[PDB]
């Protein structure tokens, strides 16, 4: 099916394979999800293309581990993923993303800025 | 509508989003769609959406793209041809089709 | 997909590798393919590959090519027409089709 | 032949009187027609005249328009894509289709 942003609460075998390709550095379980610690992913034609972790603390939220598969970059997958995470968490008034593990900070800033985030020391904010 | 391994697109000079024609050797159907990219190395040829009424998994198809150009250029034009066998193994690329003899 | 005696290609102004339409008078099927060359003098019209689902040996077909041009040129344009009988014997070439009268 | 809510034409960059292709997901038919405008906000997709042999009310279709451009421009071209659900509610517009992965 068309690109769709999903919240992952349970993982199929396929979700496990695709998440290995997105985040080869994580080996889950180790991916504990619950109401405040969420994984959102972008699904296209029955495969996960991208994912991000979200940590909710009421009106504050944090994003980490944002990655789009390199094969499908610059086709709007990351932008739609982040758009939909924000829209589905309307209670959050302040969002923060740390610059941790980011491979290319200058591409990340261009992206985050396109999404209305301001570059700050150590990450990007939208508050 | 048809996702195609990027290596196969490059071999034949087909672009993402380019109109293509598909001729199904297995069931004789002929349809026109557009190319989307599949992951390089995947060997995928995926017939998606409404086009999936026209092919099944395992069907042998011929995928073509057409361009326009002035008459003078068309007289010397050479197409980009790529030839497959087995499970989408690319065996040869070429720039001409031979002449059929009696 | 359709190999055609080179002498027939020249008569009608069709190029190797040019898109062509085939209209089958025998069985009514209409399909689009591209021309490949057959040996000059062979009289061959070979319908190959997936296209062979659409014609059989002995079928009588009409093969056409289409070009684009500006409106002003198209008003004076004359097509290249070649007429066959029997076993692909070329009987006439012409540059216009007459007007059909009541 | 196909009247389309003006808001949907604008979203996909389709013009009144532009040739369009319709691919019917429901019944597998593929046909080409031209766009006419329907009233903005009406959500209408009306298949009219001879085209109504090819779709019924309630059928899910994919409507596409194709343009031509030089090779160099086509390499960076981005299509205008709009995505629907339910009773023709527009859910998203985009400028690229993702890559299909294994």
């Amino acid at each position: 099916m068309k690109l769709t942003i999903i919240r992952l609460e349970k993982f199929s075998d396929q979700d496990r394979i695709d998440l290995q390709k997105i985040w080869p550095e994580y080996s889950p379980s180790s991916l504990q999800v619950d109401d405040n610690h969420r994984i959102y992913a972008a699904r296209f034609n029955e495969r996960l293309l991208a994912a991000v972790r979200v940590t909710l603390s009421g009106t504050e939220g944090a994003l980490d581990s944002l990655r789009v598969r390199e094969v499908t970059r610059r086709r709007g997958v990351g932008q739609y993923l982040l758009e939909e995470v924000l829209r589905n968490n309307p209670g959050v008034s302040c969002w923060w993303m740390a610059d941790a593990g980011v491979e290319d900070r200058g591409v990340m800033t261009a992206f985050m800025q396109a999404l209305g985030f301001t570059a700050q020391q150590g990450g990007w904010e939208k508050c | 509508s048809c996702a195609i391994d990027q290596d196969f697109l490059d071999a034949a000079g087909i672009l993402e989003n380019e109109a293509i024609d598909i001729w199904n050797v297995t069931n004789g159907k002929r349809f026109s769609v557009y190319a989307i990219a599949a992951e390089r190395g995947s060997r995928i040829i995926s017939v998606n959406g409404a086009a999936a009424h026209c092919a099944s998994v395992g069907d042998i198809v011929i995928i073509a793209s057409f361009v326009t150009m002035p008459d003078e250029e068309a007289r010397t034009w050479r197409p980009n041809v790529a030839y497959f066998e087995g499970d989408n193994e690319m065996k040869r690329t070429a720039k001409a089709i031979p002449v059929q003899v009696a | 997909s359709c190999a055609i005696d080179q002498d027939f290609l020249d008569a009608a102004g069709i190029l190797e590798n040019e898109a062509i339409d085939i209209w089958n008078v025998t069985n009514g099927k209409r399909f689009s393919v591209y021309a490949i060359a057959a040996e000059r003098g062979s009289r061959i019209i070979s319908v190959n590959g997936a296209a062979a689902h659409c014609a059989s040996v002995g079928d009588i077909v009409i093969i056409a090519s289409f070009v684009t041009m500006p409106d002003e040129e198209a008003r004076t344009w004359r097509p290249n027409v070649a007429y066959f009988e029997g076993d692909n014997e070329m009987k006439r070439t012409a540059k216009a089709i007459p007007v059909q009268v009541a | 032949s196909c009247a389309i809510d003006q808001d949907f034409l604008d979203a996909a960059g389709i013009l009144e009187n532009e040739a369009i292709d319709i691919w019917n997901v429901t019944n597998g038919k593929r046909f080409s027609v031209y766009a006419i405008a329907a009233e903005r906000g009406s959500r209408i997709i009306s298949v009219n005249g001879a085209a109504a042999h090819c779709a019924s009310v309630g059928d899910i279709v994919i409507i596409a328009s194709f343009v031509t451009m030089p090779d160099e421009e086509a390499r960076t071209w981005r299509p205008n894509v709009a995505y629907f659900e339910g009773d023709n509610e527009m859910k998203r517009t985009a400028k690229a289709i993702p890559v299909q992965v294994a």
Partner: peptide, 25 residues
């Protein structure tokens, strides 16, 4: 100023790996 339509390229005898009405498309 006559413009011709020419075969650009072709994939000869590839095999369909997947066919799904619900894939995009």
């Amino acid at each position: 100023s006559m413009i011709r339509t020419m075969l650009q390229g072709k994939l000869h005898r590839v095999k369909v790996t997947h066919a799904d009405l619900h894939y995009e498309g």
